Amino acid sequence: KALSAVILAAGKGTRMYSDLPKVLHTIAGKPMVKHVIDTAHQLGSENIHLIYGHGGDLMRTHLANEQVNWVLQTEQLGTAHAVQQAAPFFKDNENIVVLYGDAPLITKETLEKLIEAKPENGIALLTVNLDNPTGYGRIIRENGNVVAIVEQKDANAEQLNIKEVNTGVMVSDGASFKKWLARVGNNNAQGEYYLTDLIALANQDNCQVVAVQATDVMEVEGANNRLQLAALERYFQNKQASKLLLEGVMIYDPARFDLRGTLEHGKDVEIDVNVIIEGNVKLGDRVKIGTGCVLKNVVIGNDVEIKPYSVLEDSIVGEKAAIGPFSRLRPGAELAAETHVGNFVEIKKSTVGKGSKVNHLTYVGDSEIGSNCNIGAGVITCNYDGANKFKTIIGDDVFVGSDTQLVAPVKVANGATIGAGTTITRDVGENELVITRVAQRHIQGWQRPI
Amino acid sequence: KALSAVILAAGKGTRMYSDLPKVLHTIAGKPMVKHVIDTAHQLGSENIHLIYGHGGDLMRTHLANEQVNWVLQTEQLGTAHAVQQAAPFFKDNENIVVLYGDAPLITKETLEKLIEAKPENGIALLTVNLDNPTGYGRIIRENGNVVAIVEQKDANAEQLNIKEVNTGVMVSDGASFKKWLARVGNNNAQGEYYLTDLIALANQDNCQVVAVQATDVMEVEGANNRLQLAALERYFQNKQASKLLLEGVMIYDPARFDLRGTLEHGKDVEIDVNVIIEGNVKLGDRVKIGTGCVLKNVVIGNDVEIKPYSVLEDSIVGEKAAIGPFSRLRPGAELAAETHVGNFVEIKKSTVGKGSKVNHLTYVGDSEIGSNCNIGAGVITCNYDGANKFKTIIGDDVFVGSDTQLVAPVKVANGATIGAGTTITRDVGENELVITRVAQRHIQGWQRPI
Amino acid sequence: KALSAVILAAGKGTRMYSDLPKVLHTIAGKPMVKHVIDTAHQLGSENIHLIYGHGGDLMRTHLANEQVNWVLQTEQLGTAHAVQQAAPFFKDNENIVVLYGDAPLITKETLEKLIEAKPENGIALLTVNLDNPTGYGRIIRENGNVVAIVEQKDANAEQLNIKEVNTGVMVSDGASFKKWLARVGNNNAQGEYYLTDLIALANQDNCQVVAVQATDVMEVEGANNRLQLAALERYFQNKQASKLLLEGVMIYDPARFDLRGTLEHGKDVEIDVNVIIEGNVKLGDRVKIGTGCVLKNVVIGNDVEIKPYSVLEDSIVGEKAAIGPFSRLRPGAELAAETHVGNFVEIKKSTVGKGSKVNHLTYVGDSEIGSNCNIGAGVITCNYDGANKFKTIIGDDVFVGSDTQLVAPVKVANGATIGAGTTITRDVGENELVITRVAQRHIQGWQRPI
Numbered sequence A, B, C: 001k002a003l004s005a006v007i008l009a010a011g012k013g014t015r016m017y018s019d020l021p022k023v024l025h026t027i028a029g030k031p032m033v034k035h036v037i038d039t040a041h042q043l044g045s046e047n048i049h050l051i052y053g054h055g056g057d058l059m060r061t062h063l064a065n066e067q068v069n070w071v072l073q074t075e076q077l078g079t080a081h082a083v084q085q086a087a088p089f090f091k092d093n094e095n096i097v098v099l100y101g102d103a104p105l106i107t108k109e110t111l112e113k114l115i116e117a118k119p120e121n122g123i124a125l126l127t128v129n130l131d132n133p134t135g136y137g138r139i140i141r142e143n144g145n146v147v148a149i150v151e152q153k154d155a156n157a158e159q160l161n162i163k164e165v166n167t168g169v170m171v172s173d174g175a176s177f178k179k180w181l182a183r184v185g186n187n188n189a190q191g192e193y194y195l196t197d198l199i200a201l202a203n204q205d206n207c208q209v210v211a212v213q214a215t216d217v218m219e220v221e222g223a224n225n226r227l228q229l230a231a232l233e234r235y236f237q238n239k240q241a242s243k244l245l246l247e248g249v250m251i252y253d254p255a256r257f258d259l260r261g262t263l264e265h266g267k268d269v270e271i272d273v274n275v276i277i278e279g280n281v282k283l284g285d286r287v288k289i290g291t292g293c294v295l296k297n298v299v300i301g302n303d304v305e306i307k308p309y310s311v312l313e314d315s316i317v318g319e320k321a322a323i324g325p326f327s328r329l330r331p332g333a334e335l336a337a338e339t340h341v342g343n344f345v346e347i348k349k350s351t352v353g354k355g356s357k358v359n360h361l362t363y364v365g366d367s368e369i370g371s372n373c374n375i376g377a378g379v380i381t382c383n384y385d386g387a388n389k390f391k392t393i394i395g396d397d398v399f400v401g402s403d404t405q406l407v408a409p410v411k412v413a414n415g416a417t418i419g420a421g422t423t424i425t426r427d428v429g430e431n432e433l434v435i436t437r438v439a440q441r442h443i444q445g446w447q448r449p450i
């Protein structure tokens, strides 16, 4: 039957010592709560009820495009009170899964298993085994069905040795939630309405509560501070790296690899140590990425080698291209097949045609460069003062001599040759050779001050 | 009552295979012995007696400004002999704590606890529990008071299972040290005067020896070689990173973070992987540091972003500035608020005014640049041959065209405009436009050799 | 007596998801099979029989210069069948050691111990203790001599608790191999001729099989996929780093150090985090390597400092030189003693004489530079269009002004001085001062568009 989700995301996260609310801190480049929202969507959730409160304006701005129901909680009275804020929107005939915005690593696979196990009119409770369960609510089974969650302070000597504990994640139908949430009381040391009390209330109605164990404890771990957040980050990155390794990506050291988005890859892709992949990246067959590279939102064709300490963003690189080391591709850089970009070169919002080379100490911005061009060392595209970033157009088979300035707007036609040290302000015609006439003074017998 | 410290630092450190003496090898950028000296000072030590020997001249040069008593030991006859070298300087009425220059991670907190526990006319002995205590002197308690330290070769089957062992760190009063040190003998397999024998001598005088356990074993671990030193380094860096994380600094991977000095920070500071912080660094609120950056002795204002692979030293950066990627700030670089420094740019001993930009392939040295200037790509400040690094002075609202050389000493006044490819040797006046008149030869129908 | 080796290397390595065969994937920059071949050679193997099959053409091209006997297996019928392919080449009177091309970390020391233990006309079997031996063939000893290898599915409750298991590595004489290999059958669930059956056949002949335990399990671990390969890589790099640390090399973080070849070092060498050493590298005394450096096939003299993010290949650096940060040395770079190479500088196939400095934003290619030269910022060596990379020759004590282009072929004699912004096309004589005569237009009262 249908499914909807409730995500608790109202927490201040005081121990983060941040102006952000708790769930907006990122794992792998995206907010903890976004991980959970995405997981909820992957499960096929019809509605996603987001319980929010602290940092409300920041939540709204940071998650503006998320397809969620914004349930603004005015006061924090416990998890049961939080869930009950969304209860009026529950369908009687749908399943509801309760999730936590500060526990981001819960997987679709584990939640599918939880939902599957839910008995009619009953509850499916996600549990986990801990080597040291001290502090956590112990799962008491009579059958394989949960009759109680006994808290640390109430447990007898025998119960304290129970390793299986409550995670707080649970599934039940909407009608049952609406029914039981209205019966939850707050007579306890904290004065809070606990969602945990639904296990008791379910048993009061002779409805069975089934336990389902999480595969990894890190799926249910929350982040209360940045040390814990860093632990989740490393676990997540290791898991991502392991998946890629088993898919056939050669990651030289998975402990020194970071994926912050999505990676599409071909076969025989090699990634050296300390590479960061951000946004949506596509790598073709036999792509080799050297140490220290940063790729953000890029498409890299087959057989490309990116040499060390290259930074690429919002760019496209054709097959058999060679980039780096120390290359910078800024947004809008489009390199054709078999191109060459070398050290201390910056390309911004420019197209570079097949076979062309830009190998040293050069800035190319707002330009179109044709096929088989030779852009010499020290070449710079620039503008007049007060300009609006006008374009430099370079044709096919053009030689641009070293340390030449190309002053936009300007066009250099096919087959043109430009001598070293030239300032190009007027258009250059097809097969036109332009060389600078220098005036020099030569003084003989100049003894250096040494 | 008063406190003084004795630090054993005479060792050759043969297994380091170094020309340095043992205690001068660094942890987090400073000598092992300096860590211990600093800890001794933090405790409120009145005197610090440094027992030294091997590499004496190097010790003297490397630790010249340390407020210690230089006790030169001419021969190594054991720990008791070493401590007795400083004994004539002990006050009868002060406490003396014995520390080791090759065991650098001992904390102030642990030592305060040790001193607190010292009974009058007795000894406080720092101990530690080891899972495998094989090789170490076993602590024999009768009460919670130490009656013997039984060495591995002397221990019976029962005593070998004792996990608590001697660390060698101890506190006693000066009069008691002077008394007992004179009674220590050398009748043992090594022929050495052992400080350990004070436990026996104390009990001979019916003076109680109290045991105090160290929190972490790494506090009492020594470094005999560079493998062990590296282990201490990693433990120390992890501990530093954890502290910063709990304080609210977002360190993306604490295993790839290095602090070699002191870090002052605001809130919501983000530090990406493989960053090194050296000397005294201050970061404001919401500072973001990209991957691969090196910051040494820098002050960074609020809301600054440092992009990847930037190296900064002895520099100041104003609020909302943008630095990198691939930026180099050398000593004396002072960037005002809202400045921009880009890839392949080097700034040395220069001031750059509010809003100014230096974004590509540029060297600015020994210069003053005003507010809202545009320093084009390829611009270089230089000197005449035989000069003494003279200054380039650039006013407010100046445009410097790409690939221009500024030849110091030279002044460019407010509002001036300099065309691309210019060589500036004479002063430029207010609102003066200077453009280079180029001579070019144009040859039509030049067929390239392709 | 004499020794020869058989290496099994025929596997497809399907779970690598690669166009390469299994054993060509690299550990520390070289094919897994090459590690084993080298180890076989270090042991003093007279012949090395390489059993190959899948990716045969790639094996042949990648391992063309290896001194091995190429035994092409046409079908995979089990390990015994594989070894029997080389059996006709076994000497009756030599020992034969069987090794696996996908288990690269087996050490010479372990194999020497295995060979030593081999009883006459018997077998030496390499075994290993596993905490969880589930799945592996259990070693059954009667004496300290192996009477059976009992597989998981056949073992009784008692035998399953045996921790010692078969690795598959074994030594026996050539005559015995030829004898027993002909008796191996394939009556089992897999229908394969197993080398394991030699233990049974040896006991049938009343020949003793002796067990020898491997020191580390990682010596006998195979890599079936890239996740397992990465685990072997990290173990190997840690082991290499540990060796260097114990030899006296200061590696700041051995978890962030990579050696992919061989390193020769002096004393007091310091290597910061994220350094990669490739090919054959030699470092002198007191060499300091900053973070992020890549050194491939380089010789570095005494007292050289390489600052962060420098990339060096096929280059030589004289004593007391200073390189970096952000320096690029390409093949053929030869720097003399006391030279200086700075940020955003690229040197290719050039010699640079004693005391000379090239400190900013410069390309020097195909050049000879003499002693005590000053190569200014922005200097570029270049060629005419259609040239064949001709040479620039610069003498001793030459000053080259900033942003000057040197157009090869050209010679600049001793003591010459070149002004900033010059284009040098004609040879410059001894003590000749060359300065560019600029034409400038100065327009007063030019109000900028701001």
Ligand SMILES: COc1cc2c(Nc3ccc(NC(=O)c4ccccc4)cc3)ncnc2cc1OCC(=O)O
Pocket: A008, A009, A010, A011, A012, A022, A023, A051, A073, A076, A077, A078, A079, A082, A100, A101, A102, A103, A128, A136, A165, A166, A167, A168, A217, A220, A221, A222, A223
């Ligand atoms: C941050 O948003 C909230 C998270 C909560 C939250 N998060 C959470 C829940 C469970 C875990 N996981 C475990 O308890 C657990 C961890 C390891 C093993 C077993 C269990 C972690 C975080 N728990 C309880 N209340 C929460 C309330 C939150 O805001 C809503 C509000 O303030 O009304």
Ligand SMILES: COc1cc2c(Nc3ccc(NC(=O)c4ccccc4)cc3)ncnc2cc1OCC(=O)O
Pocket: B008, B009, B010, B011, B012, B022, B023, B051, B073, B076, B077, B078, B079, B082, B100, B101, B102, B103, B128, B136, B165, B166, B167, B168, B217, B220, B221, B222, B223
């Ligand atoms: C390097 O300076 C010295 C250190 C010593 C030294 N250092 C030391 C002492 C204790 C530890 N720690 C432990 O024994 C220990 C470690 C782990 C668990 C328990 C104990 C480590 C280094 N120990 C003994 N004698 C030492 C002598 C030294 O030079 C003075 C001289 O040569 O006279």
Ligand SMILES: COc1cc2c(Nc3ccc(NC(=O)c4ccccc4)cc3)ncnc2cc1OCC(=O)O
Pocket: C008, C009, C010, C011, C012, C022, C023, C051, C073, C076, C077, C078, C079, C082, C100, C101, C102, C103, C128, C136, C165, C166, C167, C168, C217, C220, C221, C222, C223
């Ligand atoms: C890749 O080349 C082969 C490796 C084999 C191979 N490699 C191997 C052998 C042993 C181990 N190690 C273990 O079994 C082991 C690991 C850990 C503990 C104990 C044992 C790993 C790889 N094993 C068996 N057959 C193999 C066959 C191969 O190609 C030859 C052919 O296909 O005919």
Ligand SMILES: [Mg+2]
Pocket: A378, A403, B378, B403, C378, C403
């Ligand atoms: Mg230039």
Ligand SMILES: [Mg+2]
Pocket: A403, A421, B403, B421, C403, C421
């Ligand atoms: Mg120029």
